[PDB]
Design an enzyme around this catalytic site. Structure first.
Site, PDB file in Angstrom:
ATOM      1  N   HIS A  75       0.890  -1.271  -0.133  1.00 44.59           N
ATOM      2  CA  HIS A  75      -0.096  -0.047  -0.005  1.00 44.59           C
ATOM      3  C   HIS A  75       1.082   1.211   0.105  1.00 44.59           C
ATOM      4  CE1 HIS A  75      -0.018   1.088   3.748  1.00 44.59           C
ATOM      5  NE2 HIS A  75       0.169   0.613   4.273  1.00 44.59           N
ATOM      6  N   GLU A 133      19.099   7.558   8.162  1.00 42.29           N
ATOM      7  CA  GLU A 133      18.294   8.900   9.125  1.00 42.29           C
ATOM      8  C   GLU A 133      17.484   8.977  10.497  1.00 42.29           C
ATOM      9  OE1 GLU A 133      17.369  11.370   7.569  1.00 42.29           O
ATOM     10  OE2 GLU A 133      17.170  11.371   5.013  1.00 42.29           O
ATOM     11  N   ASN A 191      16.642  12.242  11.681  1.00 45.86           N
ATOM     12  CA  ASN A 191      16.278  13.232  11.705  1.00 45.86           C
ATOM     13  C   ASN A 191      15.331  13.585  10.046  1.00 45.86           C
ATOM     14  OD1 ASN A 191      14.975  16.423  11.376  1.00 45.86           O
ATOM     15  ND2 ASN A 191      15.015  17.056  13.012  1.00 45.86           N
ATOM     16  N   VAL A 242      16.518  17.137   8.558  1.00 46.70           N
ATOM     17  CA  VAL A 242      18.059  17.716   8.395  1.00 46.70           C
ATOM     18  C   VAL A 242      19.140  16.576   7.819  1.00 46.70           C
ATOM     19  CG1 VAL A 242      19.828  18.213  10.232  1.00 46.70           C
ATOM     20  CG2 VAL A 242      17.135  19.223  10.452  1.00 46.70           C
ATOM     21  N   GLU A 266      23.353  10.002   5.923  1.00 46.96           N
ATOM     22  CA  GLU A 266      22.671   9.810   5.590  1.00 46.96           C
ATOM     23  C   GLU A 266      23.214   8.785   4.255  1.00 46.96           C
ATOM     24  OE1 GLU A 266      23.238  12.585   6.622  1.00 46.96           O
ATOM     25  OE2 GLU A 266      20.781  12.913   7.652  1.00 46.96           O
ATOM     26  N   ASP A 304      -0.217  -7.892   1.332  1.00 47.49           N
ATOM     27  CA  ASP A 304       0.656  -5.916   1.567  1.00 47.49           C
ATOM     28  C   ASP A 304       1.960  -5.821   1.575  1.00 47.49           C
ATOM     29  OD1 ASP A 304       0.998  -4.328   1.954  1.00 47.49           O
ATOM     30  OD2 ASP A 304      -0.673  -3.526   3.777  1.00 47.49           O
ATOM     31  N   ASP A 341       0.985   2.106  20.134  1.00 49.78           N
ATOM     32  CA  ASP A 341       0.969   1.067  18.417  1.00 49.78           C
ATOM     33  C   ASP A 341       1.847   2.028  17.338  1.00 49.78           C
ATOM     34  OD1 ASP A 341      -0.547   0.122  16.775  1.00 49.78           O
ATOM     35  OD2 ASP A 341      -2.275   1.050  16.506  1.00 49.78           O
ATOM     36  N   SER A 342       1.402   1.861  15.897  1.00 47.00           N
ATOM     37  CA  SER A 342       2.201   2.215  14.917  1.00 47.00           C
ATOM     38  C   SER A 342       0.957   3.225  14.414  1.00 47.00           C
ATOM     39  CB  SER A 342       2.898   1.319  13.942  1.00 47.00           C
ATOM     40  OG  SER A 342       1.876   0.531  13.707  1.00 47.00           O
ATOM     41  N   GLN A 362      -0.600   6.408  10.966  1.00 41.49           N
ATOM     42  CA  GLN A 362      -0.687   6.706   9.910  1.00 41.49           C
ATOM     43  C   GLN A 362       1.178   7.080   9.469  1.00 41.49           C
ATOM     44  OE1 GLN A 362      -3.578   9.161  11.739  1.00 41.49           O
ATOM     45  NE2 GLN A 362      -3.902   7.161  11.538  1.00 41.49           N
ATOM     46  N   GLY A 363       1.413   7.121   8.451  1.00 39.77           N
ATOM     47  CA  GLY A 363       2.786   7.568   8.401  1.00 39.77           C
ATOM     48  C   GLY A 363       3.969   6.429   8.839  1.00 39.77           C
ATOM     49  N   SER A 384       3.536   2.811   8.158  1.00 42.01           N
ATOM     50  CA  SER A 384       3.194   2.247   7.680  1.00 42.01           C
ATOM     51  C   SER A 384       4.345   2.093   5.844  1.00 42.01           C
ATOM     52  CB  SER A 384       2.649   2.636   5.721  1.00 42.01           C
ATOM     53  OG  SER A 384       0.780   2.951   6.162  1.00 42.01           O
ATOM     54  N   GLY A 385       4.754   0.661   5.857  1.00 42.18           N
ATOM     55  CA  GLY A 385       5.560  -0.020   5.427  1.00 42.18           C
ATOM     56  C   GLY A 385       6.978  -0.085   6.328  1.00 42.18           C
TER      57      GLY A 385
HETATM   58 CA   LIG Z   1      18.450  12.728   7.941  1.00 36.97          CA
END
Ligand SMILES: [Ca+2]
Length: 223
Positions: A40, A52, A54, A57, A62, A84, A171-172, A174-175, A177-178
């Site tokens: 999804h 990553e 932050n 920033v 990264e 899924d 809980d986990s 929105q965002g 996801s995956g």
């Molecule tokens: Ca960063």
């Protein structure tokens, strides 16, 4: 992640952010060239962001690598969210180090009661909205199939499991996801769905990764 804690920079080295101009989903690095995420989360124009903390920033660890291809599970149903899961290949191999590292696939399915680590940059409130910019973490147990099915009558397939707390509050969301659910150093789940976030008797539902190991290995071997 609702009711979690700040992980600490680069303490979850397999956690990736999928970026299409903005963070929209998590993922898990499973080798130098491949990420596992939720079906999804599929879209075109994905850049994988590794190392990553932050996400707003550039902090110095990264790696930003565009996806060359995405492979949604052939049996993914977007209505039921059965199967899924999706694979994303990086245009170039990530440079693996202590802060950017792959997570092992399971050799066996994890049992109810197993403690796991769920992580992501998703909403931290169960009512209203606040997105953190640093990675958040939650320790949560896998729930029994019976309690999962009782929480969500008619919706839990053999490719799903519940994890979290029936009392709510953690809980986990929105965002997230995956993103990963890791138990004893193995990727056992992918953040998939739930009714709201952190609601009483509505735990998080996760893709059961152990059912897909053969598909993942074979797909990677030919793509
Ligand atoms: Ca960063």
């Amino acid at each position: 992640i609702v009711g979690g804690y700040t992980c600490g920079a680069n303490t979850v080295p397999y956690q990736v952010s999928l970026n299409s101009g903005y963070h929209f989903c998590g993922g898990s690095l499973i080798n130098s060239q491949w990420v596992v995420s939720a079906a999804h989360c599929y879209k075109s124009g994905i850049q994988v962001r590794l190392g990553e903390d932050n996400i707003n920033v550039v902090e110095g660890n990264e790696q930003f690598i565009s996806a060359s291809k995405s492979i949604v599970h052939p049996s993914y149903n977007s209505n039921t969210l059965n199967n899924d899961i999706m694979l994303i290949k990086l245009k170039s191999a990530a440079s693996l180090n202590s802060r950017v590292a792959s997570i092992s696939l399971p050799t066996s399915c994890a049992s109810a009661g197993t403690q796991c680590l769920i992580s992501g940059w998703g909403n931290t409130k169960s009512s209203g909205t606040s997105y953190p910019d640093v990675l958040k973490c939650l320790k949560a147990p896998i729930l029994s199939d019976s309690s999962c099915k009782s929480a969500y009558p008619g919706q839990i397939t053999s490719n799903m499991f519940c994890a979290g707390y029936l009392e709510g509050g953690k809980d986990s969301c929105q965002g997230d996801s995956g993103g990963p659910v890791v138990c004893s150093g193995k990727l056992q789940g992918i953040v998939s769905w739930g009714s709201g976030c952190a609601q009483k008797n509505k735990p998080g539902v996760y893709t059961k990764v152990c059912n897909y190991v053969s598909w993942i290995k074979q797909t990677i071997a030919s793509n």
